[model samples]
Target: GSSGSSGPVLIVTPLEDQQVFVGDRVEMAVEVSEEGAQVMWMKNGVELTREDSFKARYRFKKDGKRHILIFSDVVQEDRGRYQVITNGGQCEAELIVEEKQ
Candidate 1:
């Protein structure tokens, strides 16, 4: 089997599983080969919003470009499966939240 057009590929992947305590920050990074491809991030299959709770940001690096998902003051609700999707491909990760002592 072969294809004419190659799909977007991940250049950088986030940790398979991340654990952070409350009042802490959690950030995940994902990079794709297709620079012009559209990118989308979600939590537990739900689209994430750019708010104090959850924020998704994009950046262009000199060598490679990627998107960053930031979770500020992570709480129990922040624990879930996170995903990043491009026009051609997608990847996912899981976040575990822990209570502060």
Candidate 2:
């Protein structure tokens, strides 16, 4: 519930750790109790940006009540913990990238 003021929104669903193989696609989603909740993606305790030297292999989208984090072309380097933060609450999830034999 909001009063038109700026504040943390509700988290209906939180993020969970995921394990994916190399070159595979991984997706994580967060469900909010309210719409248009100001949120950000964090990696290794910092903001996740698109113009990093590593790669822009990450994509984010706002779909109705759920915000999605799409991880394309998973690499071993992608193996790390991630968090979704809002003014209200935050969800911390780890990513496990498995190497293929």
Candidate 3:
């Protein structure tokens, strides 16, 4: 019958595992094809919040075809696994922070 139910698709994957020095900014992002869909960003299995040293940024593509998440700041405690999850799928990456030599 072809009801035509294609689930959300991640068009743009977030940044891969990265290495950053303390005090440096670490940015990560993800994109999905579903518009106005709820998305979540997690660090070490914990939902990210805009409080403390953590905050999330959001944006829609100019064509309004995709939604994205932006995270910044690289601190020692920020080193861990990060993930983006939706009703359709999810992705994960690691963050490694090193001391300035």
Candidate 4:
């Protein structure tokens, strides 16, 4: 989240379901606008600040006001309602990491 007027926007790019299997590497990009803003991620109200749970990638530039949160090494247990909070504003989204069986 930036110190700007608007909160960040989470974006999940289109990925093949089969290609995104267990132990596979992928990045779920959560885009946003704001630099040096308080950014915290959660799953169903539970904070995720660990290596196995989430991945952190932030860039708050002068011209590019966009930031991305990349969740790598996605797993089945990662399937849940994910949320991002910043500057008194909160945005939530769902990450359905299901196995193709």
Instruction: List clash counts for every candidate, in order.
Output: 0, 0, 0, 2
Using all chains and alpha carbons, the TM-scores for the candidates as numbered come to: 0.67, 0.82, 0.65, 0.52
Model 4 error, position 13 (Å): 12
Q: Each candidate: RMSD to true structure?
A: 5.9, 3.2, 5.4, 6.7
User: How would you encode candidate 4's per-residue C-alpha lDDT over 10-100 as one tens digit per residue?
Assistant: 3322222233465555543444444444456677788756355224432222223334445445677666666766554566666556575
Highest lDDT scorer: 2
Candidate 4 C-alpha error for residue 82, in Å: 1.0
| lDDT tens digits by residue: candidate 2, 18-82 | 87788887888889876777777788888876454454757778897798877767788887777
Query: For model 1, how does the per-residue alpha-carbon lDDT over 1-101 read when each residue is reduced to its tens digit?
Result: 26756565554554468878877866676766765445677778787554565243332232346665565457887788878766666777888788989
Clash total of candidate 2: 0
lDDT value, candidate 4, whole model: 0.50
Clashing pairs in 3: none
TM-score of 3: 0.65
Which 10 successive residues of model 2 have the least lDDT summed? Answer: 48-57
Residue 10, candidate 2: alpha-carbon lDDT: 68
Better model by lDDT, 1 or 2?
Answer: 2
Q: Could you give me the TM-score of model 1 versus the true structure?
A: 0.67
Q: How does model 2 fare in lDDT? A: 0.79
lDDT of 1 at 46: 89
Query: Candidate 3, residues 17-62: lDDT per residue as tens digits?
Result: 8888977755564566665556677888897653555243332232
What is the alpha-carbon lDDT of model 3 when measured against the actual structure?
0.63
